[PDB]
Amino acid sequence: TLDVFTKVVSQADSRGEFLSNEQLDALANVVKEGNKRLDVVNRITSNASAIVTNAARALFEEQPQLIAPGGNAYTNRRMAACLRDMEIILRYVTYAILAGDASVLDDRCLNGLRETYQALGTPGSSVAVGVQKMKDAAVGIANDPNGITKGDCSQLISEVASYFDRAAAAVG
């Protein structure tokens, strides 16, 4: 579990020198964009369950053979587990957005997902589509201004689109 701060700390520990001035200048900018980071993380967990069901219907339409009998997500149990899991991507993504680093995302939700499926028989590609259907809706939920002050966070939202693309490409 690493931060943006402890990323710089563990990197400066390996060289064994003091923290340089521009690194403190860069981390002072993270303090200024710190309140926008709580704007984006609070907006996802409020719309957490609404974006799980909405990405599930768009997945199970466009691959109809899953629900269909013989499919990997056919019976109500496996289906329940798969549906439940789509939160676990979002659980570890919004951890990484609030952390600002992809270390927590890597060793919990990324380290064995492409591992565990060969023994399970679930298709890797199907899961990727599911997460890539979360990404265009999770970015779109945090994009629109309604009752918040207007700001610019395109340099910060691209981190969120990178986090889903890190989660997608490591499996499929």
Residue least distant from ligand CYC (Cβ)? 151
Three-state secondary structure call for residue 34: helix
Query: Which long-range contacts (C-beta less than 8 Å, at least 24 apart) are formed by 49-56?
Result: 49/87, 51/90, 51/134, 51/137, 51/138, 51/141, 52/83, 52/86, 52/87, 52/90, 54/137, 55/86, 55/130, 55/133, 55/134, 55/137, 56/83, 56/86, 56/130
Does residue 122 touch ligand CYC according to CB under 6 A?
yes
x/- mask, a second copy, residues 132-161, rule CB under 8 A, reads ------------------------------
Does residue 50 touch ligand CYC according to CB under 6 A?
no
Does residue 158 touch other proteins according to CB under 8 A?
no
Among 13, 87, 115, 136, binds a second copy (CB under 8 A): 13
Stretch in the footprint of other proteins (CB under 8 A) among 82-90, 124-132, 133-141, 150-158: 82-90
User: Residue 141: CB partners within 8 Å, gap ≥ 6?
Assistant: 43, 44, 47, 51
User: Cα 3 to the chain's mean position, in Å?
Assistant: 15
**Annotated binding-site members for (2R,3E)-phycocyanobilin:** 82, 153
- Residues of this chain that interact with ligand CYC (CB under 6 A) are 35-36, 38-40, 42, 57, 60, 66-67, 72-76, 78-79, 81-82, 85-86, 88, 92, 108-109, 113, 116, 120, 122-123, 126-127, 130, 142-145, 148-151, 153, 157
